[PDB]
Copies of this chain bind each other. A is one copy, B any other.
Amino acid sequence: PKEMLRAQTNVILLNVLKQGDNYVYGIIKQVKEASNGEMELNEATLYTIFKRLEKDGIISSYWGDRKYYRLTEIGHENMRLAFESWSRVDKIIENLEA
């Protein structure tokens, strides 16, 4: 299911960035560690996703003193809205089971 994995990777990448500004290799390390090894992102997958997020204003980038990525203001608020509504969804689903 290609576009569910895509969605999953998006959420994860945004959450890494939420923890702090980071660069591609740093992100890939953090995701591999937090996933107990089960998830090893390809450098190129990150460039594809980051090209799209930048265009949509959700993230921005800049150079160290190596390319760093940053969650924008829009990006933070979009994450908050997403977490809020998906949490409603999770409780609705909880009420359907019992």
Contact = CB atoms under 8 A, between A and B. Distances in A.
Identical copies in the complex? 2
Interface residues of A, number: 30
Interface in A62-79: 78
Interface string A79-98: 00110011011001101110
A12 interface: yes
Interface string A8-51: 10011001101100000000001101110011000000000000
Contacts of A33: 95
Interface of A: 1, 4-5, 7-8, 11-12, 15-16, 18-19, 30-31, 33-35, 38-39, 78, 81-82, 85-86, 88-89, 92-93, 95-97
